[PDB]
């Protein structure tokens, strides 16, 4: 059973999620540009600033977001930006999106000044995620439920976020029975991988500082959402 409320809700989210595409002229740079450490970082920076914009536009459409406390609206974006960005790339690597150019994207990530410490677990995570064999609807809902985490730092009205989140967890919960009655513990596996995804918040802050002390800079938008000083 999937409630009618939950079917419309779900298709509405697929609207937002499908609508989130970044232009080809931008993503073609993953394949097109020279491969050197400096160009690799530049391109990752550019895919990221572009992606953040798309992120915001997706979050905006999330039902009831536009009627949240403004201060909390920001606390969520900053809170979820990394986790959401890691899921998007997980989808690219696992689903082999043409426009993601995954093999070349991996080459660029592997030579952009990131410590092995972080590369190893990052790719372990992507591998595990793929093994869940998630649909596009699941990637989409997880991103939605990640953005609307009520446990982020500096949220005032926690319960008001719970209310926006709980329905999406419910819909995902169902999809996990309905699109996989074979494996029972599928939904729980997803949630565990979310915990695993949380650990990348700390890695990413060290990644940023390493980059910065080696005189890389980001964009003003990234600098805001990632809190670069």
């Amino acid at each position: 059973e999937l409630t009618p409320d939950q079917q419309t809700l779900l298709h509405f989210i697929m609207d937002s999620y499908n609508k989130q595409r970044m232009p080809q002229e931008i993503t073609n740079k993953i394949l097109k540009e020279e491969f050197s450490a400096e160009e690799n970082f530049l391109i990752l920076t550019e895919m990221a600033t572009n992606h953040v914009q798309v992120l915001v536009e997706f979050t905006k459409k999330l039902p009831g977001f536009q009627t949240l406390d403004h201060e909390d609206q920001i606390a969520l974006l900053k809170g979820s930006a990394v986790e959401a960005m890691f899921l998007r790339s997980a989808e690219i690597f696992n689903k082999k999106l043409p426009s993601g150019h995954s093999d070349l994207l991996e080459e660029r990530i592997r030579n952009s000044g990131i410590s092995d410490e972080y590369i190893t677990p990052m790719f372990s995570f992507y591998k595990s995620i793929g093994e869940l064999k998630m649909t596009q609807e699941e990637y989409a809902l997880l991103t939605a439920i990640v953005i609307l985490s009520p446990d982020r730092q500096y949220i005032k009205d926690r319960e008001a976020v719970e209310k926006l989140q709980e329905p999406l967890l419910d819909v995902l919960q169902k999809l996990c029975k309905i699109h996989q009655p074979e494996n029972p513990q599928h939904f729980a596996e997803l949630l565990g991988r979310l915990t695993e995804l949380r650990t990348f918040n700390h890695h990413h802050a060290e990644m940023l500082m390493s980059w910065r002390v080696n005189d890389h800079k980001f964009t003003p938008l990234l600098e805001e959402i990632w809190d670069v000083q």
Binding site: V56, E57, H70, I74, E224, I225, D227
Partner: peptide
């Protein structure tokens, strides 16, 4: 902080 996030939120 906020400035550019705000700006994207309003559109």
């Amino acid at each position: 902080d906020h400035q550019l996030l705000r700006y994207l939120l309003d559109k």
